[PDB]
Design a protein around this motif. Structure first.
Motif, PDB file in Angstrom:
ATOM      1  N   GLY A 133     -27.547 -52.285   6.839  1.00  0.00           N
ATOM      2  CA  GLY A 133     -26.594 -53.308   6.458  1.00  0.00           C
ATOM      3  C   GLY A 133     -26.094 -54.100   7.643  1.00  0.00           C
ATOM      4  O   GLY A 133     -26.476 -53.843   8.785  1.00  0.00           O
ATOM      5  N   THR A 134     -25.252 -55.094   7.380  1.00  0.00           N
ATOM      6  CA  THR A 134     -24.640 -55.819   8.474  1.00  0.00           C
ATOM      7  C   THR A 134     -23.301 -55.211   8.793  1.00  0.00           C
ATOM      8  O   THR A 134     -22.387 -55.257   7.978  1.00  0.00           O
ATOM      9  N   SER A 135     -23.183 -54.660   9.991  1.00  0.00           N
ATOM     10  CA  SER A 135     -21.971 -53.983  10.408  1.00  0.00           C
ATOM     11  C   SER A 135     -20.769 -54.919  10.419  1.00  0.00           C
ATOM     12  O   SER A 135     -20.911 -56.134  10.552  1.00  0.00           O
ATOM     13  N   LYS A 136     -19.580 -54.358  10.328  1.00  0.00           N
ATOM     14  CA  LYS A 136     -18.390 -55.197  10.379  1.00  0.00           C
ATOM     15  C   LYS A 136     -18.283 -55.917  11.732  1.00  0.00           C
ATOM     16  O   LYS A 136     -18.610 -55.353  12.769  1.00  0.00           O
ATOM     17  N   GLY A 137     -17.856 -57.177  11.695  1.00  0.00           N
ATOM     18  CA  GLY A 137     -17.744 -58.007  12.885  1.00  0.00           C
ATOM     19  C   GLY A 137     -16.409 -57.781  13.577  1.00  0.00           C
ATOM     20  O   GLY A 137     -15.372 -57.742  12.947  1.00  0.00           O
ATOM     21  N   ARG A 138     -16.427 -57.559  14.877  1.00  0.00           N
ATOM     22  CA  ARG A 138     -15.173 -57.429  15.588  1.00  0.00           C
ATOM     23  C   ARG A 138     -14.927 -58.668  16.415  1.00  0.00           C
ATOM     24  O   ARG A 138     -13.964 -58.728  17.169  1.00  0.00           O
ATOM     25  N   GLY A 139     -15.780 -59.675  16.230  1.00  0.00           N
ATOM     26  CA  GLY A 139     -15.702 -60.882  17.028  1.00  0.00           C
ATOM     27  C   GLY A 139     -15.807 -60.515  18.501  1.00  0.00           C
ATOM     28  O   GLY A 139     -16.439 -59.527  18.853  1.00  0.00           O
ATOM     29  N   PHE A 140     -15.145 -61.301  19.345  1.00  0.00           N
ATOM     30  CA  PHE A 140     -15.148 -61.123  20.779  1.00  0.00           C
ATOM     31  C   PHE A 140     -14.463 -59.812  21.134  1.00  0.00           C
ATOM     32  O   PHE A 140     -13.251 -59.706  21.050  1.00  0.00           O
ATOM     33  N   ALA A 141     -15.244 -58.812  21.546  1.00  0.00           N
ATOM     34  CA  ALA A 141     -14.683 -57.481  21.781  1.00  0.00           C
ATOM     35  C   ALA A 141     -14.600 -57.104  23.250  1.00  0.00           C
ATOM     36  O   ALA A 141     -15.465 -57.410  24.061  1.00  0.00           O
ATOM     37  N   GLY A 142     -13.530 -56.405  23.564  1.00  0.00           N
ATOM     38  CA  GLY A 142     -13.313 -55.942  24.897  1.00  0.00           C
ATOM     39  C   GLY A 142     -14.201 -54.775  25.228  1.00  0.00           C
ATOM     40  O   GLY A 142     -14.856 -54.151  24.394  1.00  0.00           O
ATOM     41  N   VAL A 143     -14.173 -54.474  26.505  1.00  0.00           N
ATOM     42  CA  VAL A 143     -14.992 -53.474  27.105  1.00  0.00           C
ATOM     43  C   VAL A 143     -14.587 -52.091  26.593  1.00  0.00           C
ATOM     44  O   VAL A 143     -15.419 -51.200  26.453  1.00  0.00           O
ATOM     45  N   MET A 144     -13.318 -51.924  26.239  1.00  0.00           N
ATOM     46  CA  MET A 144     -12.876 -50.646  25.701  1.00  0.00           C
ATOM     47  C   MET A 144     -13.286 -50.475  24.233  1.00  0.00           C
ATOM     48  O   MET A 144     -13.698 -49.391  23.837  1.00  0.00           O
ATOM     49  N   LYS A 145     -13.168 -51.517  23.417  1.00  0.00           N
ATOM     50  CA  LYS A 145     -13.595 -51.375  22.026  1.00  0.00           C
ATOM     51  C   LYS A 145     -15.125 -51.340  21.928  1.00  0.00           C
ATOM     52  O   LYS A 145     -15.658 -50.456  21.283  1.00  0.00           O
ATOM     53  N   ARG A 146     -15.817 -52.288  22.570  1.00  0.00           N
ATOM     54  CA  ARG A 146     -17.286 -52.369  22.524  1.00  0.00           C
ATOM     55  C   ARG A 146     -17.994 -51.165  23.127  1.00  0.00           C
ATOM     56  O   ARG A 146     -18.948 -50.678  22.566  1.00  0.00           O
ATOM     57  N   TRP A 147     -17.608 -50.762  24.329  1.00  0.00           N
ATOM     58  CA  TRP A 147     -18.419 -49.784  25.054  1.00  0.00           C
ATOM     59  C   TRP A 147     -17.680 -48.486  25.390  1.00  0.00           C
ATOM     60  O   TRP A 147     -18.180 -47.693  26.178  1.00  0.00           O
ATOM     61  N   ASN A 148     -16.492 -48.278  24.824  1.00  0.00           N
ATOM     62  CA  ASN A 148     -15.692 -47.090  25.150  1.00  0.00           C
ATOM     63  C   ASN A 148     -15.460 -46.942  26.650  1.00  0.00           C
ATOM     64  O   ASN A 148     -15.471 -45.842  27.188  1.00  0.00           O
ATOM     65  N   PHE A 149     -15.278 -48.052  27.349  1.00  0.00           N
ATOM     66  CA  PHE A 149     -14.896 -47.930  28.739  1.00  0.00           C
ATOM     67  C   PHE A 149     -13.519 -47.294  28.786  1.00  0.00           C
ATOM     68  O   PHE A 149     -12.762 -47.316  27.804  1.00  0.00           O
ATOM     69  N   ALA A 150     -13.190 -46.745  29.941  1.00  0.00           N
ATOM     70  CA  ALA A 150     -11.963 -45.994  30.126  1.00  0.00           C
ATOM     71  C   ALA A 150     -10.773 -46.896  30.440  1.00  0.00           C
ATOM     72  O   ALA A 150      -9.636 -46.457  30.366  1.00  0.00           O
ATOM     73  N   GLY A 151     -11.029 -48.150  30.795  1.00  0.00           N
ATOM     74  CA  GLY A 151      -9.952 -49.045  31.190  1.00  0.00           C
ATOM     75  C   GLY A 151      -9.272 -48.480  32.424  1.00  0.00           C
ATOM     76  O   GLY A 151      -9.880 -47.684  33.145  1.00  0.00           O
ATOM     77  N   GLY A 152      -8.028 -48.895  32.672  1.00  0.00           N
ATOM     78  CA  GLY A 152      -7.272 -48.454  33.837  1.00  0.00           C
ATOM     79  C   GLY A 152      -6.038 -47.642  33.513  1.00  0.00           C
ATOM     80  O   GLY A 152      -5.749 -47.387  32.352  1.00  0.00           O
ATOM     81  N   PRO A 153      -5.295 -47.218  34.543  1.00  0.00           N
ATOM     82  CA  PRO A 153      -4.038 -46.496  34.292  1.00  0.00           C
ATOM     83  C   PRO A 153      -2.995 -47.392  33.669  1.00  0.00           C
ATOM     84  O   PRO A 153      -3.055 -48.608  33.864  1.00  0.00           O
ATOM     85  N   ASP A 154      -2.045 -46.818  32.941  1.00  0.00           N
ATOM     86  CA  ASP A 154      -0.963 -47.641  32.401  1.00  0.00           C
ATOM     87  C   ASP A 154       0.319 -47.537  33.207  1.00  0.00           C
ATOM     88  O   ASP A 154       1.297 -48.216  32.909  1.00  0.00           O
ATOM     89  N   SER A 155       0.296 -46.747  34.269  1.00  0.00           N
ATOM     90  CA  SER A 155       1.389 -46.788  35.235  1.00  0.00           C
ATOM     91  C   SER A 155       0.791 -46.558  36.624  1.00  0.00           C
ATOM     92  O   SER A 155      -0.318 -47.005  36.865  1.00  0.00           O
TER      93      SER A 155
END
Ligand SMILES: [Mg+2]
Ligand SMILES: [Mg+2]
Ligand SMILES: [Mg+2]
Ligand SMILES: [Mg+2]
Ligand SMILES: [Mg+2]
Ligand SMILES: [Mg+2]
Ligand SMILES: [Mg+2]
Ligand SMILES: [Mg+2]
Ligand SMILES: [Mg+2]
Ligand SMILES: [Mg+2]
Ligand SMILES: [Mg+2]
Ligand SMILES: [Mg+2]
Ligand SMILES: [Mg+2]
Ligand SMILES: [Mg+2]
Ligand SMILES: [Mg+2]
Ligand SMILES: [Mg+2]
Ligand SMILES: [Mg+2]
Ligand SMILES: [Mg+2]
Ligand SMILES: [Mg+2]
Ligand SMILES: [Mg+2]
Ligand SMILES: [Mg+2]
Ligand SMILES: [Mg+2]
Ligand SMILES: [Mg+2]
Ligand SMILES: [Mg+2]
Ligand SMILES: [Mg+2]
Ligand SMILES: [Mg+2]
Ligand SMILES: [Mg+2]
Ligand SMILES: [Mg+2]
Ligand SMILES: [Mg+2]
Ligand SMILES: [Mg+2]
Ligand SMILES: [Mg+2]
Ligand SMILES: [Mg+2]
Ligand SMILES: [Mg+2]
Ligand SMILES: [Mg+2]
Ligand SMILES: [Mg+2]
Ligand SMILES: [Mg+2]
Ligand SMILES: [Mg+2]
Ligand SMILES: [Mg+2]
Ligand SMILES: [Mg+2]
Ligand SMILES: [Mg+2]
Ligand SMILES: [Mg+2]
Ligand SMILES: [Mg+2]
Ligand SMILES: [Mg+2]
Ligand SMILES: [Mg+2]
Ligand SMILES: [Mg+2]
Ligand SMILES: [Mg+2]
Ligand SMILES: [Mg+2]
Ligand SMILES: [Mg+2]
Ligand SMILES: [Mg+2]
Ligand SMILES: [Mg+2]
Ligand SMILES: [Mg+2]
Ligand SMILES: [Mg+2]
Ligand SMILES: [Mg+2]
Ligand SMILES: [Mg+2]
Ligand SMILES: [Mg+2]
Ligand SMILES: [Mg+2]
Ligand SMILES: [Mg+2]
Ligand SMILES: [Mg+2]
Ligand SMILES: [Mg+2]
Ligand SMILES: [Mg+2]
Ligand SMILES: [Mg+2]
Ligand SMILES: [Mg+2]
Ligand SMILES: [Mg+2]
Ligand SMILES: [Mg+2]
Ligand SMILES: [Mg+2]
Ligand SMILES: [Mg+2]
Ligand SMILES: [Mg+2]
Ligand SMILES: [Mg+2]
Ligand SMILES: [Mg+2]
Ligand SMILES: [Mg+2]
Ligand SMILES: [Mg+2]
Ligand SMILES: [Mg+2]
Ligand SMILES: [Mg+2]
Ligand SMILES: [Mg+2]
Ligand SMILES: [Mg+2]
Ligand SMILES: [Mg+2]
Ligand SMILES: [Mg+2]
Ligand SMILES: [Mg+2]
Ligand SMILES: [Mg+2]
Ligand SMILES: [Mg+2]
Ligand SMILES: [Mg+2]
Ligand SMILES: [Mg+2]
Ligand SMILES: [Zn+2]
Lengths: 37, 204, 174, 140
Positions: free
Chosen positions: B106-128
């Motif tokens: 099927g055609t997967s749900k569209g997330r439009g322009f996705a960030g590196v954390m949503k698209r690729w499960n990147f860890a991102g950075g610290p929040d403090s």
RNA sequence: CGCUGAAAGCAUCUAAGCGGGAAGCCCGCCCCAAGAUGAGGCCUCCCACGGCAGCCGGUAAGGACCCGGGAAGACCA
RNA sequence: CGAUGUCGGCUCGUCGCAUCCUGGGGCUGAAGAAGGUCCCAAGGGUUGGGCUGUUCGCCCAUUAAAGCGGCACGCGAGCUG
């Protein structure tokens, strides 16, 4: 299998054979089996 | 290699041998074959299937000639099943029996322009701890003068979803022919109302 | 000193037809085609096949012996035929014939079924003796190798599949 | 007097059987034909060579142990994207490419050189679909 | 690791030839993909239109624009 | 030297193979089980925590394993400091 740069007869039963571009030593004694490398 | 076209209708669960089994319901049949692909003619074997009746007023002339040649009513969608040649002139859910395993595309749900954390499960950075405006950033994308460039295929932000996905080896839990309903255990790509293809699984 | 010069005695009635790059040998037990270097010459005499080499170069010297032996094995193969015997050794270890097939019980969780290829025949006289027989010398030896390989002679016990006439050479355990 | 320059000429279609020929030594000749260097009016800046049809490209021959030791290579641009294909495998999958590659490597680089390569038609098997151009058979 | 086997009467997995043999290599699975300019294929639709491999013009099959929107989406698509 | 920001961490990887694990082997002073040693092999994998800025290292609890190196001792117009 011993792998080394100097392969030599170890005992008088040892036979130096050339096989597929490599020097081997084969013998009835498994310890003496050598491949050059 | 049997296959059929369908619409994803929704999810529930049923009870089978005192187990709750999650299901996706699919409205699959009935599909008229409107063209056959043959080795002599097309160089391969497949069947072009039709699905969902269309208002003739919305069907232009070249498409109409295509249907008419098949002696077939106008239909909303044309899709081929590869290496399939049904004996009949119509494919229904009956081609599947409960217990069979199927692949669903099927055609997967569209997330439009996705960030590196949503698209690729990147860890991102610290929040403090001093982190400065990089909480969701990719971090480094490279090295230095060697190689002084970025690899093709680098995981980066960008559109994600609304793409073809196939989920494999799904168990057919039930089929309800009088409603052209297929029950497949588990999850199928795309939104309810989405067009899907159900095929006999390629896993053994 | 020379295998290639040695004349090949051809028993009647087996026929040796020479051809380009090959010789065909027919006999009471079947036929065999022997692939043969175009550089070598194969000669058919009264009750004898001979092989001649074009020169004394190292390669021709090498091909010569090979070719005479190859042809000779073919001649022997279609007349006498070839056999190899195997002895199964070890307390539970036995064989039996299952249709054409050879079934080995040699201490795995399962029996092993060996399928005869064409030209190969299995015989199981005793439960501890297997014979492989056929017209093709290399094939007979290959299949016998395969069957021995299933469970090779142990290093520490008189146990496994042996060539008939293979010496039992063991090492001390503890 | 200025050196003669040819007005456009009807190119000559040529047919070559590759069976049993040595890969590289056949290539050099196909290249020469492609460039048109066999013609007395050869001009280096126009496409005026022959169209070369080749058949039995699958039966091209090669010396030494090249069947298994000659490696064709392709780089995809991706990490680890270096693909290595031995001659044997190429022959067993896209045989016509073996000659094609050999010749392409023997043509000048550039726009004209690329254009010349298109005038080469290589076929595995004894047949070509070019009867219409009536290719003249060439022993080389 | 073998089979058969000379050179080298023996022997040798090899010089001719043939087996077996890795999570590795090729394929197989999933996704993209004919700008694959080498631009591929199949089904169907339109038609030989006026004036002066080119120009102007009105069309055909079709398409776009505009509008109502959308688990599609930054705009665009 | 009219500037090529230097440790360590984080993030993101990618490569080498002299391989830590998993796969395939030979030898063993290989009974078995478990090891030792060498050969093939880079596909994938290679944990969480205490100390210390640390890299490293020691330690705790596990693990199939807790590999070693290159990429300006990879990565500060990406963050930290
Ligand atoms: Mg000595
Ligand atoms: Mg010996
Ligand atoms: Mg049920
Ligand atoms: Mg779809
Ligand atoms: Mg969306
Ligand atoms: Mg992000
Ligand atoms: Mg996430
Ligand atoms: Mg994701
Ligand atoms: Mg994080
Ligand atoms: Mg932190
Ligand atoms: Mg976080
Ligand atoms: Mg700050
Ligand atoms: Mg902040
Ligand atoms: Mg960043
Ligand atoms: Mg820097
Ligand atoms: Mg660079
Ligand atoms: Mg999209
Ligand atoms: Mg939904
Ligand atoms: Mg005779
Ligand atoms: Mg004579
Ligand atoms: Mg011990
Ligand atoms: Mg010439
Ligand atoms: Mg060559
Ligand atoms: Mg091809
Ligand atoms: Mg060149
Ligand atoms: Mg130049
Ligand atoms: Mg031996
Ligand atoms: Mg032997
Ligand atoms: Mg050989
Ligand atoms: Mg094999
Ligand atoms: Mg092999
Ligand atoms: Mg074997
Ligand atoms: Mg194999
Ligand atoms: Mg696996
Ligand atoms: Mg596609
Ligand atoms: Mg196209
Ligand atoms: Mg396409
Ligand atoms: Mg190209
Ligand atoms: Mg096209
Ligand atoms: Mg095609
Ligand atoms: Mg209109
Ligand atoms: Mg909108
Ligand atoms: Mg300076
Ligand atoms: Mg300055
Ligand atoms: Mg400056
Ligand atoms: Mg400056
Ligand atoms: Mg500067
Ligand atoms: Mg690294
Ligand atoms: Mg290594
Ligand atoms: Mg290992
Ligand atoms: Mg191991
Ligand atoms: Mg053990
Ligand atoms: Mg012990
Ligand atoms: Mg070991
Ligand atoms: Mg070793
Ligand atoms: Mg070794
Ligand atoms: Mg690896
Ligand atoms: Mg890698
Ligand atoms: Mg690694
Ligand atoms: Mg740790
Ligand atoms: Mg504490
Ligand atoms: Mg700490
Ligand atoms: Mg520390
Ligand atoms: Mg602390
Ligand atoms: Mg320290
Ligand atoms: Mg200490
Ligand atoms: Mg443990
Ligand atoms: Mg272990
Ligand atoms: Mg480094
Ligand atoms: Mg340094
Ligand atoms: Mg330093
Ligand atoms: Mg640095
Ligand atoms: Mg570092
Ligand atoms: Mg840095
Ligand atoms: Mg900074
Ligand atoms: Mg820093
Ligand atoms: Mg930087
Ligand atoms: Mg900077
Ligand atoms: Mg930067
Ligand atoms: Mg910079
Ligand atoms: Mg810090
Ligand atoms: Mg400070
Ligand atoms: Zn010895």
């Amino acid at each position: 299998m011993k792998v080394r740069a100097s392969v030599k007869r170890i005992c008088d039963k040892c036979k130096v054979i050339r096989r597929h571009g490599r020097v081997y030593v084969i013998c009835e004694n498994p310890k003496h089996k050598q491949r050059q490398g | 290699m049997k296959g059929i076209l369908g619409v994803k209708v929704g999810m529930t669960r049923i009870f089978r041998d005192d187990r709750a089994v999650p299901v996706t319901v699919i409205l699959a049949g009935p599909c008229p074959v409107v063209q056959r692909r043959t080795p002599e003619k097309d160089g391969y074997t497949a069947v072009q299937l039709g699905f969902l009746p269309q208002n003739p007023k919305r069907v232009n002339r070249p498409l109409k000639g295509h249907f008419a040649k098949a002696g077939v009513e106008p239909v909303r969608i044309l899709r081929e099943i590869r290496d399939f040649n049904p004996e009949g002139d119509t494919v229904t859910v009956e081609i599947f029996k409960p217990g069979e395993r199927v692949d669903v595309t099927g055609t997967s749900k569209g997330r439009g322009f996705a960030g590196v954390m949503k698209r690729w499960n990147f860890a991102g950075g610290p929040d403090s701890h001093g982190a400065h405006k990089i909480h969701r950033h990719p971090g480094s994308i490279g090295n230095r003068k060697t190689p002084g460039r970025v690899y093709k295929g680098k995981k980066m932000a960008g559109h994600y979803g609304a793409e073809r996905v196939t989920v494999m080896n799904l168990e057919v839990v039930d089929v309800i022919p009088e409603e052209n309903l297929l029950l497949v255990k588990g999850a199928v790509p795309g939104p309810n109302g989405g067009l899907v293809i159900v095929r006999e699984t390629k896993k053994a | 000193s020379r295998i290639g010069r040695l004349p090949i005695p051809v028993p009647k009635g087996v026929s040796v037809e020479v051809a380009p790059g090959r010789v065909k040998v027919k006999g009471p037990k079947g036929e065999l085609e022997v692939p043969v270097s175009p550089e070598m010459r194969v000669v058919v005499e009264e009750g004898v096949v001979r092989v001649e080499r074009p020169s004394d170069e190292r390669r021709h010297k090498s091909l010569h012996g090979l070719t005479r032996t190859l042809i000779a094995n073919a001649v022997k193969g279609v007349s006498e035929g070839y056999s190899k015997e195997l002895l199964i050794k070890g307390i539970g270890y036995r064989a039996r014939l299952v249709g054409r097939a050879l079934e080995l019980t040699v201490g795995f969780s399962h029996p092993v079924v060996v399928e005869p290829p064409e030209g190969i025949t299995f015989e199981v006289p005793e439960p501890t003796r297997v014979r492989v027989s056929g017209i093709d010398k290399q094939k007979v030896g290959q299949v016998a190798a395969n069957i021995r390989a299933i469970r090779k002679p142990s290093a520490y016990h008189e146990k496994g599949i042996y060539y008939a006439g293979e010496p039992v050479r063991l090492k001390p355990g503890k | 007097m200025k050196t003669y320059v040819p007005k456009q000429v009807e190119p000559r279609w040529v047919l070559i059987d590759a069976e049993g020929k040595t890969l590289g030594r056949l290539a050099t000749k196909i290249a020469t034909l492609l460039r048109g260097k066999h013609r007395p009016d050869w001009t280096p800046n126009v496409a005026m060579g022959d169209f070369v049809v080749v058949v039995n490209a699958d039966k091209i021959r090669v010396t030494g142990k090249k069947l298994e030791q000659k490696i064709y290579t392709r780089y995809s641009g991706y990490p680890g994207g270096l693909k290595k294909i031995p001659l044997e495998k190429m022959l067993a999958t896209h045989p016509e490419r073996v000659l094609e590659h050999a010749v392409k490597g023997m043509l000048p680089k550039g726009p004209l050189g690329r254009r010349l390569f298109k005038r080469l038609k290589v076929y595995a098997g004894p047949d070509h679909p070019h009867q219409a151009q009536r290719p003249e058979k060439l022993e080389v």
